[PDB]
Amino acid sequence: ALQLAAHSDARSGPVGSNGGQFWSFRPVRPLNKIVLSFSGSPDQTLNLISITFSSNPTDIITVGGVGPEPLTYTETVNIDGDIIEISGMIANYKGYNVIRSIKFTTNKKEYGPYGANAGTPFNIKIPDGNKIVGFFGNSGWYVDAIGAYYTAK
Amino acid sequence: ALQLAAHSDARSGPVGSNGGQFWSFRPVRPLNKIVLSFSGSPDQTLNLISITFSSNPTDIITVGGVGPEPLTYTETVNIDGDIIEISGMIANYKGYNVIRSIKFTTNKKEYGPYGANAGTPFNIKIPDGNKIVGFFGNSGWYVDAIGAYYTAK
Amino acid sequence: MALQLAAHSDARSGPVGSNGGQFWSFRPVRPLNKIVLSFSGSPDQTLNLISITFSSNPTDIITVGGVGPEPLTYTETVNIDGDIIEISGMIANYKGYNVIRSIKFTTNKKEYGPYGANAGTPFNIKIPDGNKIVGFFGNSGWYVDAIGAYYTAK
Amino acid sequence: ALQLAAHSDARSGPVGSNGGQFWSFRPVRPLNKIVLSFSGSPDQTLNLISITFSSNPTDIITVGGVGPEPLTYTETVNIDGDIIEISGMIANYKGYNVIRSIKFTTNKKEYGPYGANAGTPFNIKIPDGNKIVGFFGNSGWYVDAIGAYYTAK
């Protein structure tokens, strides 16, 4: 049978730092929901612990949060349209450089920033006419690194 | 700590044919369940239409199965230990070369092959001492191509 | 502290073929303009693809396959004009291994090949419309076991 | 007709910043010669503009240096061993964040850092028992980002 070469989407990143596990999530249908969980609080500071990406109840991934630290705040966001860019801050949290804040931008609106403001900035940008269709990265107790899969609209 | 570059696991594959969408699923925790959905019937010929990979608990992906055709049979595979090899057959279906049967092999037990085991064979093997920790590929109405992410135990 | 502006990696198509001892990858900054195919055996009979040499002016070059003792007896020099859009060929058994045996390169206008032993299992590397192939990767040892391409929009 | 899945090596990185062109160089034999091309002068400021990686014999690639700025100094690094880590500094040059200095480290020797050793540090390390067998990144007039391919020794 003819081996008709199968394709893999281009990538941007990862940014952030090395973690114990590589992770990757590129669903067939567009991402429409993101759930972010933190420890701490606004009064002090929100420590990003995990992020959950979903396309529906049958397509979900959770990165970070494998540690014992109790979560104190979670927020569920509905993503309208295609993500086109993300940015955020990276900084040390209990001995590890991790993603500390994140902001998503689609062709419809902005979401965030969610997390702590301080540290080194990062941002994922793609060429004109493209959309982000998945994410990948490294994680452990926290979200250490993140990058995106993108393709032409 | 140090600003260490993040890593991406090695890949094996993909095998099969190009498809409309690229898909990827590499969860932090070990893949422990796989649900294969087909059309047709066991006493006749099973037609793989979609596959669902999951990791305990809230990590799941469903690839293929975007078309109309109703599901008439499903095979639930509960994985024990680390998958180290997968194999199966590729053959034409309603005008498309797609994965038609698949088998998963761990360190001590085998699961399958499930589906219509006839056509062009394939198998994903990895270096010894490694384990498969995720899968990626192409899909549309069906599962067009498949490959694996692996890393050392 | 410097902004971490995520760097990109081109999309891929493939690889097709079979697993091999070494992974190889060659994606030069400039266009891929010359490809040299090296074979063993006499061409008035049957040529066995042993290695491929990809290059890009002025001096970017890579040679994959050909690590073994088989001598090269014939070479084919393909001077690519334009952007490569697709490649194809055949995979067959050679001395116990499933390897790339023939290969054809296709740009927008003309096409080069196929060269080698055009017999066995066909493969085809096609990219989306408006894109071009800008590099190759694969597995190889004594022979060229597998190959794939990197592509990006024109 | 057996489709025995072909593999692709694990990756570390890339680090730095997005660039106009993606580049990749992973030769069959190990790397043994690296040429760093700079602008300016050793006594003043050394500006890394391009890098030439080489694996004897004939396997060579040059990334960065596509710009008009003339080279005025080069550092030839002959490595006789397996590279296990690289590191360096990133900092601005003509309005762009680029790789400014770089150091290569094998199982038993260090080479560098060569270039303007100032700015934001980067470290690409790999799991123990592995070796870097290739490099990839983005570049234009300069070397914007770099990452490595690695595999078990």
Numbering used by the authors:
A (entry chain D), B (entry chain C), D (entry chain A): 2 to 154
C (entry chain B): 1 to 154
According to the publication:
Structural and functional analysis identified IPO as a member of the JRL family but with a different tetrameric association. The monomeric IPO from residues 1 to 154 shows a typical β-prism fold found in the JRL family, with 12 β-sheets (β3-β14) and 2 additional short, extended, N-terminal β-strands (β1-β2). Four IPO protomers form a compact tetrameric association by swapping their extended N termini from residues 1 to 10. Thus, the wound-inducible protein IPO from sweet potato has versatile carbohydrate binding properties and might play a role in plant defense.
The apo IPO showed an orthorhombic space group of I222. A reasonable volume of the unit cell (Vm) for the Matthew coefficient was estimated at 2.19 Å3/Da and 44% solvent content by 8 IPO molecules. However, only 5 IPO molecules in an asymmetric unit could be built after molecular replacement. We obtained a higher Matthew coefficient with 3.51 Å3/Da and 65% solvent content. In the packing diagram for apo IPO, we observed a tetrameric association with an additional monomer in an asymmetric unit. The additional monomer could form a tetrameric association with the other 3 neighboring molecules, which were generated by symmetric operations (-X, Y, -Z), (X, -Y, -Z), and (-X-1, -Y, Z). So 4 IPO molecules could form a tetramer.
